[PDB]
Amino acid sequence: GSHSMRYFYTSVSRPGRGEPRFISVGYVDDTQFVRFDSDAASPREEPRAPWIEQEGPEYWDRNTQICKTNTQTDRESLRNLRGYYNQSEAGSHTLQRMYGCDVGPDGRLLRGHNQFAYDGKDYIALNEDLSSWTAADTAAQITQRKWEAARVAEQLRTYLEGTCVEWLRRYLENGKETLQRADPPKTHVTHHPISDHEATLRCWALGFYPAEITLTWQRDGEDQTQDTELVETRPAGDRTFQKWAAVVVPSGEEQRYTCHVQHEGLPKPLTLRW
């Protein structure tokens, strides 16, 4: 894969209860490093990872200002969208944005991203060529025309190919001790009798990073996909992740089941048994 940086913006209107609230979080791969909340008393971009704390006041002032500007811009956008869709000012609406870069082994941009969603639906996205847009509907085509005329794609391309990957490389080096270190899962199998006839085997993967992982049960070397309960990968709360997979087995057949774990932190794929 490739290392990445992403910013996630969320603005939500609240008619009758003031202006829309803007929230921003930034990630390097699966590690959050900054946050901003427009409802805060003194709205500031704040550190969220140890390796970003070293950045100077100029960094925090600049990014705080951009977030303040983005707060106002999103409020204009929300107003604008309401008009495009002929919606009243009574209902709450949501605007989301994700953007960022993937850096390649040469240290150059591997792929750039910049996409928007309105009320949970794809609205407009910058294509991989970073020079054109994909608009979801007629409303988004109005936005497209504005952004074409304003040469938005070019400006973003410049950011993505330069600033973005430059700072990403910086973060990766400053936080190398954690960001460029893969923590393999601590794994085990538990056994939970359901009756005299069956029991649950649950395969655990705990304390791993990054979040990407594969957990599978096999019986006699055959995949048990459609019989396995796979929970969504979840945060431990300490910057690492958790996941488990479970299968119901006939009593006395436990030995025929094997759990298989793939993760970039492992020397090699694991096979587990009860």
């Binding site: 983005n70 811009t73 407009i124 973003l156």
Partner: peptide, 8 residues
């Protein structure tokens, strides 16, 4: 953050 400002 990107310092490019354009309302939808």
């Amino acid at each position: 953050h990107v310092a490019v400002e354009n309302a939808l």
